[PDB]
Design a protein around this motif. Structure first.
Motif, PDB file in Angstrom:
ATOM      1  N   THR B  25       0.833  -1.193   0.000  1.00 22.67           N
ATOM      2  CA  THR B  25       0.000   0.000   0.000  1.00 22.67           C
ATOM      3  C   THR B  25       0.870   1.245   0.000  1.00 22.67           C
ATOM      4  N   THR B  26       0.196   2.392  -0.017  1.00 21.35           N
ATOM      5  CA  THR B  26       0.851   3.690   0.073  1.00 21.35           C
ATOM      6  C   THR B  26      -0.126   4.612   0.792  1.00 21.35           C
ATOM      7  N   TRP B  27       0.046   4.743   2.103  1.00 17.65           N
ATOM      8  CA  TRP B  27      -0.807   5.610   2.903  1.00 17.65           C
ATOM      9  C   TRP B  27      -0.372   7.050   2.684  1.00 17.65           C
ATOM     10  N   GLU B  28      -1.180   7.801   1.948  1.00 16.29           N
ATOM     11  CA  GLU B  28      -0.869   9.184   1.651  1.00 16.29           C
ATOM     12  C   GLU B  28      -1.152  10.068   2.859  1.00 16.29           C
ATOM     13  N   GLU B  29      -0.597  11.277   2.818  1.00 18.76           N
ATOM     14  CA  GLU B  29      -0.857  12.266   3.853  1.00 18.76           C
ATOM     15  C   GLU B  29      -2.333  12.633   3.842  1.00 18.76           C
ATOM     16  N   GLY B  30      -3.037  12.308   4.925  1.00 25.32           N
ATOM     17  CA  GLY B  30      -4.471  12.474   5.024  1.00 25.32           C
ATOM     18  C   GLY B  30      -5.240  11.175   4.937  1.00 25.32           C
ATOM     19  N   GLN B  31      -4.640  10.134   4.360  1.00 25.74           N
ATOM     20  CA  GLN B  31      -5.278   8.825   4.320  1.00 25.74           C
ATOM     21  C   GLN B  31      -5.227   8.148   5.680  1.00 25.74           C
ATOM     22  N   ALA B  32      -4.108   8.292   6.386  1.00 27.60           N
ATOM     23  CA  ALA B  32      -3.923   7.703   7.702  1.00 27.60           C
ATOM     24  C   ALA B  32      -3.110   8.658   8.556  1.00 27.60           C
ATOM     25  N   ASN B  33      -3.565   8.885   9.784  1.00 23.87           N
ATOM     26  CA  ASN B  33      -2.867   9.749  10.733  1.00 23.87           C
ATOM     27  C   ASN B  33      -2.026   8.863  11.644  1.00 23.87           C
ATOM     28  N   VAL B  34      -0.730   8.797  11.365  1.00 27.33           N
ATOM     29  CA  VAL B  34       0.208   8.038  12.182  1.00 27.33           C
ATOM     30  C   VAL B  34       0.803   8.972  13.221  1.00 27.33           C
ATOM     31  N   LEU B  35       0.805   8.535  14.476  1.00 30.25           N
ATOM     32  CA  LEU B  35       1.307   9.325  15.592  1.00 30.25           C
ATOM     33  C   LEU B  35       2.609   8.713  16.084  1.00 30.25           C
ATOM     34  N   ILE B  36       3.687   9.483  15.997  1.00 28.13           N
ATOM     35  CA  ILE B  36       4.954   9.093  16.605  1.00 28.13           C
ATOM     36  C   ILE B  36       4.872   9.507  18.071  1.00 28.13           C
ATOM     37  N   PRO B  37       5.350   8.708  19.030  1.00 27.19           N
ATOM     38  CA  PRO B  37       5.333   9.177  20.420  1.00 27.19           C
ATOM     39  C   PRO B  37       6.247  10.379  20.598  1.00 27.19           C
ATOM     40  N   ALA B  38       5.769  11.355  21.373  1.00 28.81           N
ATOM     41  CA  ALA B  38       6.531  12.582  21.581  1.00 28.81           C
ATOM     42  C   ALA B  38       7.865  12.293  22.259  1.00 28.81           C
ATOM     43  N   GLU B  39       7.839  11.495  23.323  1.00 26.25           N
ATOM     44  CA  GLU B  39       9.025  11.171  24.106  1.00 26.25           C
ATOM     45  C   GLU B  39       9.731  12.438  24.597  1.00 26.25           C
ATOM     46  N   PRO B  40       9.049  13.275  25.383  1.00 26.15           N
ATOM     47  CA  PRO B  40       9.684  14.515  25.848  1.00 26.15           C
ATOM     48  C   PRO B  40      10.785  14.244  26.858  1.00 26.15           C
ATOM     49  N   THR B  41      12.033  14.478  26.459  1.00 30.49           N
ATOM     50  CA  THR B  41      13.173  14.263  27.340  1.00 30.49           C
ATOM     51  C   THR B  41      13.068  15.211  28.533  1.00 30.49           C
ATOM     52  N   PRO B  42      12.800  14.723  29.765  1.00 34.40           N
ATOM     53  CA  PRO B  42      12.652  15.665  30.883  1.00 34.40           C
ATOM     54  C   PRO B  42      13.971  16.317  31.258  1.00 34.40           C
ATOM     55  N   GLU B  43      13.934  17.222  32.233  1.00 31.00           N
ATOM     56  CA  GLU B  43      15.137  17.931  32.645  1.00 31.00           C
ATOM     57  C   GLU B  43      16.167  16.955  33.195  1.00 31.00           C
ATOM     58  N   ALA B  44      17.420  17.143  32.786  1.00 28.86           N
ATOM     59  CA  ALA B  44      18.502  16.315  33.293  1.00 28.86           C
ATOM     60  C   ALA B  44      18.642  16.511  34.796  1.00 28.86           C
ATOM     61  N   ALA B  45      18.665  15.403  35.530  1.00 31.00           N
ATOM     62  CA  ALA B  45      18.725  15.459  36.985  1.00 31.00           C
ATOM     63  C   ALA B  45      20.067  16.034  37.410  1.00 31.00           C
ATOM     64  N   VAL B  46      20.035  17.221  38.004  1.00 26.46           N
ATOM     65  CA  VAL B  46      21.229  17.928  38.447  1.00 26.46           C
ATOM     66  C   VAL B  46      21.340  17.790  39.955  1.00 26.46           C
ATOM     67  N   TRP B  47      22.543  17.507  40.427  1.00 25.43           N
ATOM     68  CA  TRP B  47      22.775  17.448  41.859  1.00 25.43           C
ATOM     69  C   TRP B  47      22.964  18.867  42.406  1.00 25.43           C
ATOM     70  N   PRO B  48      22.361  19.216  43.544  1.00 28.39           N
ATOM     71  CA  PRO B  48      22.501  20.586  44.050  1.00 28.39           C
ATOM     72  C   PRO B  48      23.940  20.905  44.417  1.00 28.39           C
ATOM     73  N   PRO B  49      24.528  21.971  43.863  1.00 32.22           N
ATOM     74  CA  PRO B  49      25.842  22.411  44.352  1.00 32.22           C
ATOM     75  C   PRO B  49      25.700  23.189  45.652  1.00 32.22           C
ATOM     76  N   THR B  50      26.483  22.803  46.652  1.00 28.02           N
ATOM     77  CA  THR B  50      26.462  23.544  47.904  1.00 28.02           C
ATOM     78  C   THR B  50      27.255  24.841  47.746  1.00 28.02           C
ATOM     79  N   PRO B  51      26.828  25.937  48.371  1.00 29.36           N
ATOM     80  CA  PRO B  51      27.545  27.198  48.192  1.00 29.36           C
ATOM     81  C   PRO B  51      28.748  27.299  49.112  1.00 29.36           C
ATOM     82  N   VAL B  52      29.718  28.101  48.680  1.00 27.53           N
ATOM     83  CA  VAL B  52      30.966  28.297  49.408  1.00 27.53           C
ATOM     84  C   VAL B  52      31.285  29.784  49.373  1.00 27.53           C
ATOM     85  N   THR B  53      31.231  30.433  50.532  1.00 31.46           N
ATOM     86  CA  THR B  53      31.486  31.865  50.632  1.00 31.46           C
ATOM     87  C   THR B  53      32.989  32.106  50.677  1.00 31.46           C
TER      88      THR B  53
END
Lengths: 106, 53
Positions: B25-53
């Motif tokens: 077959t050949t599913w044309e644009e508009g013949q079939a709506n294929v959904l790719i998963p978004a897969e939103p990469t969340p924020e990279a887990a950052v370790w809290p830096p402690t402050p130093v005066t």
């Protein structure tokens, strides 16, 4: 369905139904239900019915073909165009009407 | 098989009886709506830096 094709003698393509001299074929030609009897296929050549599933070989000549009508209940058959097939009607020359000789009277 | 009335052909195949490897077959644009998963990469887990005066 399919087509009938003439191709040189030798190996038959697998799937093709040979149509040798003496073969009878019930078909529909220009709306006319007919029987075609094969008689005197030429030498160095042979004829076979090729359904659509069967690929034709090289150097083949489609003598007559059918259309694609799978949903149809009553098939249409073929349409032999002028030049596709030379059909000969018998001449049937009506000879002279047999006349009895009239005798003369003076 | 004949189709009935009020039918909608979602997708169809071509006529290729001689073909050994079918094309499908050949599913044309508009013949079939294929959904790719978004897969939103969340924020990279950052370790809290402690402050130093």
């Amino acid at each position: 369905t399919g087509c009938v094709a003439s191709f040189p003698e030798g190996d038959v393509p697998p799937g093709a139904v040979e149509c040798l001299p003496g073969q009878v074929i019930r078909t529909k030609v220009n709306g006319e239900d007919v029987m075609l009897e094969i008689d005197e296929v030429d030498p160095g050549y042979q004829v076979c019915w090729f359904k659509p599933d069967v690929p034709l070989p090289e150097n083949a000549e489609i003598l007559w073909s059918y259309p694609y009508e799978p949903t149809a209940a009553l098939p249409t058959g073929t349409t032999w165009e002028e030049g596709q097939a030379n059909v000969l009607i018998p001449a049937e020359p009506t000879p002279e009407a047999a006349v009895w000789p009239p005798t003369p009277v003076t």
